[PDB]
């Protein structure tokens, strides 16, 4: 149930256009970075 | 600390996943590729 962290999206992480059924990035490409934490501070981060 | 020059091709990864399939079917004078890339992929 617990929150690790909630992150916005940044300039490198943003998406210009996403059609219905499409993906960002588009189908044949690679996933995204998830490393920014808007002020460019390298989002840090039993169980 | 090693450097090597390279060459980028616009559609060299869109015709790779093609099978030759030496024989052709009815009227099909072309082939198909498993995936399909655009020139936004070097």
UniProtKB/TrEMBL annotation, chain A:
<protein>
    <submittedName>
        <fullName>ADP-ribosyltransferase binding component</fullName>
    </submittedName>
</protein>
């Amino acid at each position: 149930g617990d929150t690790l962290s909630t992150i916005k999206a940044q300039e490198n992480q943003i998406g210009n256009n996403l059609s219905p059924g499409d993906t960002y990035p588009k189908k044949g490409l690679s996933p995204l970075a998830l490393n920014t934490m808007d002020q460019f501070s390298s989002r840090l981060i039993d169980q | 600390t090693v450097s090597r020059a390279t060459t980028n091709s616009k559609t060299e990864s869109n015709t790779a996943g093609v099978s030759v399939n030496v024989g052709y079917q009815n009227g099909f004078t072309a082939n198909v590729t498993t995936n399909y890339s655009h020139t936004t992929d070097n």
